[PDB]
Amino acid sequence: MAIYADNSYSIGNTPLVRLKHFGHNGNVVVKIEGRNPSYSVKCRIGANMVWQAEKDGTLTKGKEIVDPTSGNTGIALAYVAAARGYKITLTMPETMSLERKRLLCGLGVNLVLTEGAKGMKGAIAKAEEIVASDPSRYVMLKQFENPANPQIHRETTGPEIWKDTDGKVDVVVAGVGTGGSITGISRAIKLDFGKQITSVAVEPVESPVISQTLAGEEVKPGPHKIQGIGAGFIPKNLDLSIIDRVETVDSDTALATARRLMAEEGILAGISSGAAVAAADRLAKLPEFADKLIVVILPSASE
């Protein structure tokens, strides 16, 4: 009954684990998206974005994926492309780690390196150039705007949380990169299951564009070290309407929190998992949130 046709379908069904050294009386519970193909939450959108492109006819036998991503999305797309038999090109700043390069090359990616100094702008520019050269050949999946992104979270991530909490979840805390996670989860719990939970978006204090935007202040992006969050803009896949609260976390707190997850909980999560937990811990220690079950997405693992 339970044999996946390929590795793309093995996505999700990730565990909920209660934290002992965060929250209050066990009110903080984490969902470990590190327990996935390719070791992060992006496995879900890598899978669904391909599936959707196949269904709508935009991706066929023969055609090749092209995408600018310096992160988990690249790894996710590569694994799915490998599992389903697609050629894929990923553009990225030349400054990417040898580890990451080797892993992508190993997955069979055509890696196209761009000028480090030009950063992501460089990579996106080149990706668009490649597609321009033969639009009938190349397809750009577009994680920041593709509805298949939050759609998988609505169908899988959100329902898994509803299910495993017996509908008792009261707050969802997720870092925002594409926004797919918080948006999808939120729509599922609020609209599909009908529960008025608190949806808490998490972003770097160093680049707090969601907080600035909603406050009507000048939006001023900045650099930070919380890999996976803080795009420095509002992505189309963040539905602001479903966000109840926005919490900011600093890089150093985020880091130290991840180290504490490892040493005190035995949970191997990334820096952005640190950022999400720090934010949740802060809510968890407010009397308002004392009787509330807070669920925190940990987007990735640490190797």
Binding site: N72, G177, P221, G222, P223, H224, G228, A231, F233, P235
Partner: peptide, 7 residues
């Protein structure tokens, strides 16, 4: 993700 911008 990796560098939507910055990071």
């Amino acid at each position: 993700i990796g560098d939507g911008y910055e990071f």
